Write a protein that binds this DNA or RNA. Structure first.
Length: 246
RNA sequence: ACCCGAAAGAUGGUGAACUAUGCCUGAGUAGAAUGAAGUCAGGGCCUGAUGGAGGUUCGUAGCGAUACUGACGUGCAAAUCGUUCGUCAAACUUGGGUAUAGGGGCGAAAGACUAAUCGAACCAUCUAGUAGCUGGUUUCUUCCGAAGUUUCUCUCAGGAUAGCUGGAGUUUUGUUAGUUUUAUCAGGUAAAGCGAAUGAUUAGAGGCCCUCGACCUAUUCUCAAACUUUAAAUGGGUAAGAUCCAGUGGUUACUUCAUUGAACUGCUGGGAUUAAUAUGACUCCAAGUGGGCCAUUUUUG
RNA sequence: AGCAAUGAGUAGGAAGACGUGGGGAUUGUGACGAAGCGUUCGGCGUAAGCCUGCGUGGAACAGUCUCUAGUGCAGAUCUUGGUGGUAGUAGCAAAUAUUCAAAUGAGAACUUUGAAGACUGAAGUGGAGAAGGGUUCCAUGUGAACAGCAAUUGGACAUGGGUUAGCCGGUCCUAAGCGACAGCUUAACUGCGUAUACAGUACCUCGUUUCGCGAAAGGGAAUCGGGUUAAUAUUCCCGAGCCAGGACGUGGAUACUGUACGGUAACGUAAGUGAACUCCUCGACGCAGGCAGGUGCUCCGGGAAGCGUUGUCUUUGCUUUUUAACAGCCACCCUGGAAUCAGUUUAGCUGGAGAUAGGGUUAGCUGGCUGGUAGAGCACCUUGGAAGGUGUCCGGUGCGCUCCUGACUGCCCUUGAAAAGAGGAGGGAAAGUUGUUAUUUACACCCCUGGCCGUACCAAUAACCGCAUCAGGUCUCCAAGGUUAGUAGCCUCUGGUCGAUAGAAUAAGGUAGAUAAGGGAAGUCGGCAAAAUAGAUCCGUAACUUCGGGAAAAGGAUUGGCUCUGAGGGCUGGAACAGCUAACUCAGAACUGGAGCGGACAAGGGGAAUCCGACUGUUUAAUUAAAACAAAGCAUUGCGAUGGCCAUAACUGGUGUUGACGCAAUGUGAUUUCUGCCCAGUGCUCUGUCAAUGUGAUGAAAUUAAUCAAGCGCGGGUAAACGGCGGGAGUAAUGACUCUCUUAAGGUAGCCAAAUGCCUCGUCAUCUAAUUAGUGACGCGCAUGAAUGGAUUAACGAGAUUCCCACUGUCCCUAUCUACUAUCUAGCGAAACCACAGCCAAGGGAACGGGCUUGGCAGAAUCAGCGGGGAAAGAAGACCCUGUUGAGCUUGACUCUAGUCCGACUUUGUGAAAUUUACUUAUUCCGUUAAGUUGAGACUCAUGCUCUGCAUGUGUUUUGGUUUUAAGGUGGCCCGCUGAUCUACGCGGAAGACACAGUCAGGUUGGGAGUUUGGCUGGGGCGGCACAUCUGUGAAACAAUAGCGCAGGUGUCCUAAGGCAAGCUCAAUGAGAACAGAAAUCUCAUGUUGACCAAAAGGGGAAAAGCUUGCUUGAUUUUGAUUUUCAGUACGAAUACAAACUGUGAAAGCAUGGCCUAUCGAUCCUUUAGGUCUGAGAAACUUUCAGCUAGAGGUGUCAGAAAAGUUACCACAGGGAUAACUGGCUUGUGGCAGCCAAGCGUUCAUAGCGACGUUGCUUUUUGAUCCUUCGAUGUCGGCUCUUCCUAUCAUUGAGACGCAGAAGUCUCAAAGUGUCGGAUUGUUCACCCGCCAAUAGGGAACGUGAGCUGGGUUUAGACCGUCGUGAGACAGGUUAGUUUUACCCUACUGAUGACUUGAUACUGCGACAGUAAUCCAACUUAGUACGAGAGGAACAGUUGGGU
């Protein structure tokens, strides 16, 4: 018996995300008339450290098309982007860093960040610091487009989907070692409580499938099926291959 | 269901005032030591200042609790007191608010903590839960008076079954017996046996040159729970007349070569206790008991 | 009534009586005394019981026959209540402390007041709040009880009284979060809940957020001084203000063809309009560091008051000298143009994107001056018996302490809330025509109102929580002087307190605290405890190293007081001078002292190595702080959102305000250095078997071949997945090398008697006088080894080991001193425990008696101690076994199951083609403030072709501006349309008849549930089957008869090895026959069974029961009886007939399987055989079904459940029916002593020995056993302390010798005296170094835990190795882990003490008990005796030493 801390994480409660001083969900500007029949001049007013992520957020000030008021979207900041810079969102904007073109306008070989999976998605792919999705090639029409993701994989995507030209800022922030436990602690405090992880072998055979025994060993295969239930699925899940790569 | 007694199970609720962890908003922590980058000068990268970094060191408050296996141990105290000791600007300490609840939580992981309750909290109920196991079980006299053995049993600390025992009814008195005698059988122990079989065993004799041998013939030493020709004592069986003996007729699908037999029956004779001694001899219902131990002789490891 | 015989009794049965509460019937008693109770007034009955005198009592009760029951107590660790002994006992001992007088009172160690003396010692025991408490606050009064002595006192008791707000808080806002709306789930209970139609009577034009709760520490309108009450105050009063809302009035500003002016500017002043809408600011924010300035505090000096000291000195020491909120006034611009760069901080920074400089503007604090304001407050003086006065002044100082501000510098894979509310700006909507106007409601003054609730007190060594007035715990603020680096320690001022039962003595033993000559760990498991070191300055500092460290390494010297000298600033008037003057900081010298001086306080012991973990960090609240957890680094795994992992009954959520430099799931554990081989096993993963449905055939119909998903098979990959990694001979003592059997691969690099090596205290060095320890090597390593990570490693450690120096009372070896105790008194005053009690020896006994038997004995009553006994107390043994008792955990146990994968059907419609791919409306997903979609059209320029063309086509992109309440054009008499195109009401996309969902079907599913995990048993377990069953023996001559006794056997075999008849004779021996023998085949003679009969062993058998041939199937059918086990049940096996039908033989007969004794199976269920059979209950026919009778399918635990582990995290009921200790019986084994005489002993059995044999003793070894103990006798060893035994090591006196002397060996009387210091190990033993006269062996519950110790063993944490798939296991190793109570009785040791032919006093006697001395050496005797020589004694005497 007893439920494993793998299983307790879905329950919510104490494993929820620490969202409080985070400064708004980062997105592209919601698909307008203006963006898809021409373009709309943004102005970058601020650049902000959002806590619990590597990327900066640019805060951008568009004029509203219909009312007198002045709107404000917060993007994930492509690097080479400064306070005072005009961004130009839309279909008929130039291919330069900052700007938010649809993917069919971008000529292949282009580096793109913060890309929309669907049309009007607001921007899902390649948002983490340093990353980008490169364009491979178009359709005959310009309807659909190939992209290569930060993983490796190759994704067909609608051409009327859009993203920012250039690489996301905060590039290469894993090349340092955190020397201290303290520096790990300050990292995961402003995210969820996922730290410190206890090894399941140290636990008793109640609390985990590995734990127990007069020597500190696992005792059955660490590799486990996709078909196994909640609370079996620990260790190496559905693994094609094990051991050191080459 | 004679009375009292579990470890547990389930149903429905109450708790984070202690503690575990997250979140929001507040507060807190002398004085020393060491002297990182950066900067300034002088000398040809060295020398001197400057500077004030660190999950750095010494050490207050605060958090903690190593040793004395000190004191105390019907305590001041259901965890305290003394001297000593760990850490002290951080993965730190801490108030209030808020989130997580019982096969659930929370866990820098000890099965820890979750109101002195934790290898599954607490409260009430199902519940007077079940117990082949412990402990108790309340007046007097009178009469009779056991068993620890048989078989079957997931049986070996229990049952069922028979026996031993009591009570309630009857049948009934030349019939009973843990005994001998008279006559007749069965038995293979004790002893005895090997110049009897079978098996074990010592000793010599007498049967082309030896030679111990061979084997044979008559003798000899000693033996046997799983060898025996022979064979006691003590025990065991049956019989000793009225539920008998004889003579004669009938019945019969049996039996015979045949009223020849066989068994059963009718009648007619013969006979009253036909060895000793003593002496009146079913049916029902039910209890307790099914751990036994000892002694003389026999006897197995 | 008579006669005779008889009379024990637990468990148990039956019979007759006695007694109790009520009902029915009947006979009665009683206020002249009922019931009950007490009693030496008594009586009766075998007894249960009954009757009754006397006393008390005051109202109901009894006898007899019946009916009825909540009907009889010594026990239940029974229940409730009451009461003892223990006992006037344990005890009231922390927090330094009280004393004297007077007053009050019945009464004073304890109340109050004074005087002294102490403590607290501003991170206070002080002054204020919160939580919690709830009247404890204040006054007056008091009989109890309470305040562990007292009490006149009180937080007790009683009767009264007390809490005043626009400004102090709540109230208002929103945070983490939480309730509800729309709906959505569910039978509801619940659970989810950001979805929705939520200003200018009438006319327009706007319109995206839903209501509320959530902070007495976050945000926020405004308050301060003095006085006042027995108890309240920023709340009352006096005075001085401020804020929110709303406002009259008089007098000023400004405008009147339209909202003030000034300055070059930064910006300014008494005023100086600003609607909709929009943007901005404040509210609004981290930590560390130093620097500067300020408040308050502390400090030094002068002046004026009062006070203190005065034998002596002292222009002296101390206290007071204060000023509130509120109100007024005291970075940026211009000129200019920088290199010979300049300005500037403690630190760095700043500057042609305009520095220095000169002149301005602005921000500010808790700064200065005046008002407030001296009238108040404070300190004094004089008249009244409360009136009136003077004074309150003027300056310094600082790395000082406190809090605040300011600008800087640094740190982060950490970047440090929101909303209410207040204001600004852009915008220009409105109004206003020189007067009742109109903007000013904060232009100045004036006027009015401010609700509701909290408000006392404690906030802790007595108001809270711990059952309590409990040495415990519980958030915040302020924080003085001296010493010092210092909020350290030590002493003090303000404020607070003396509350903690006292007095007397000063025994042992305690508790804490001191000190010890000589030696210096010899003590001990172990340096445990305690010592020693310690501050500052100057000098000096290694191995090793990740170059940062190690380092305060190690190792040295100095320090006090007093008198001097030198160096280090600031402000004034213009070569540097002249005046005035202020810090505590360094350096050095002289002198002086009992050589002291960080003088008290405070304050590291050090060094050399090994093991583990890198480090800081964390942990088992109340036995485990570590080597365990974590950690950074390293590596693997899954996942591109219709997704990965996870929650949910459902709806739907978490990760996710997320997107691979990410989230999720694992394993290793910094750095350095490496991570070898194995894919057969078990997992994981990659591309024949065969369910439901549906289809087709058969038959009257129910029923009864193809097709056939996933999975499993088949075929690959994968070890930083679980894991695994060999033997044997020969060969130059050794085996480079050759051969051989075998695995998926055969342990590679490394490392080792390891925290891992059984043998093992391994072997060789080293440390030691001596080492089961430590270190360094050596490896056939029981059982090392590579991210189950291998080998290292600086720094670090309340970690585990060893050695050295220093230092010590740990030790030799104990001794003294201090306080509080114990002790004695006054007052107060428990509890555990208690069958009855308390002197021993032996005996027997349930095998270690306080009681019993036989002895020794035995004299009141008491006090202080002590730990031998009471198998003392504390707990229904936690070890072990039993139970058809559990629970936690595991899995390849049995039965399932959430989840998931897969197929079918519904959802499910419309098309097309020969299963594929078109449609869109079901259904699904995403986005938007549902704003611009579909198809046509022109507006501008533009690549440019022809002015008008199809179009391909674009138009804001040059700068951190602005874009809102449209202008224009044009029509209605002041309001419209166009500008701003028509189109069709599809908000815009993505997917789409597939997903999803519902119901069935199949696979997977310790994630989870429920359950099980035999018995016998010289304890259980392992082993075995004694669990069904046969033979022989045990077995004691009928029968019966046990053990885990003995020797063996069975789960079959066979159409013949069954049946019958006939013929024949077998094993073996003897003598014979070409090839031929020891064995072939043939022949005669002899052959009592010596062969053979399917198999164990035993019976039985010769014209057979054996062998060979012939013919056959009785090994058939129908059911009963009997025998065997036995209950006289069943099964099985067998026997004897009956009624059939066959076989063989001439026939008699024989044959119902084997010549006889073993060779096997209920109910239920299934299955087949039999009948013209019975039933399916409305009636026929006819499939299927149910029956009746007889076989088979099987339970071997064999009279017949369907079944794996583990628990050291454990639990319950029990068990001495049953193990691990002592004790008891036994004595194989161990130990000790005899008897015989073969030989040894030059010769000689016996001086001394003693083979082959043989007889005893012992309970100091170890077994064997299970009697005692499981509602507990505290399981090793050491220390301490006593006594006993003799089987004598030494000492005394002898005897014998292969005894010359010396030295010995053997034996007798002998237990009087003695038997030691150390190294290693937990040791008991052992083995060494040494001494000595000698270092003998044993017992006393394997003496000795309310005597200690806790090293070992034997709980819970953790590590290694081997075993196990795992949880876990180990008589394998390793480290960390609570040792409770005496005050009872006796015993022992000490203390008083009643009484006896009187009192009292002194001197004595000595029954009896206990005993104490014992060893060695030197000098002479003596270089003598004796001896061939070497060597070499003794007694008496003398002198010392040990214990």
């Amino acid at each position: 018996g007893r439920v494993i801390r793998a299983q307790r994480k879905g329950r919510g409660s104490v494993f929820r995300a620490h969202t409080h001083k985070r400064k708004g969900e980062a997105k592209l500007r919601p698909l307008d008339f203006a963006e898809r029949r021409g373009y709309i001049k943004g102005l970058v007013k601020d650049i902000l450290h959002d806590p619990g992520r590597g990327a900066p957020l640019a805060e951008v000030s568009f004029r509203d098309a219909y009312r007198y008021k002045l709107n404000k979207q917060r993007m994930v900041a492509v690097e080479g982007m400064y306070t005072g810079q005009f961004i130009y969102c839309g279909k008929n904007a130039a291919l330069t860093i900052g700007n938010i073109l649809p993917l069919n306008k971008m000529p292949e070989g282009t580096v793109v960040s913060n890309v929309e999976e669907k049309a009007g998605d607001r921007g899902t792919l390649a948002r983490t610091s340093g990353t980008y999705a490169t364009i491979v090639g178009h359709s005959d029409d310009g309807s659909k487009t190939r992209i290569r993701l930060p993983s490796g994989a190759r994704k067909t995507v609608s051409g009327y989907s859009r993203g920012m030209v250039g690489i996301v800022a905060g590039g290469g922030r894993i090349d340092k070692p955190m020397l201290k436990a303290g520096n790990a602690y300050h990292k995961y405090k402003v995210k969820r409580n996922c730290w410190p992880k206890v090894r399941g072998v140290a636990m008793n055979p109640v609390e985990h499938p590995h734990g127990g025994g007069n020597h500190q060993h696992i005792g059955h295969p660490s590799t486990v099926s996709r078909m196994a239930a909640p609370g079996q699925k620990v260790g190496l899940i559905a693994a094609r291959r094990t051991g050191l790569l080459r």
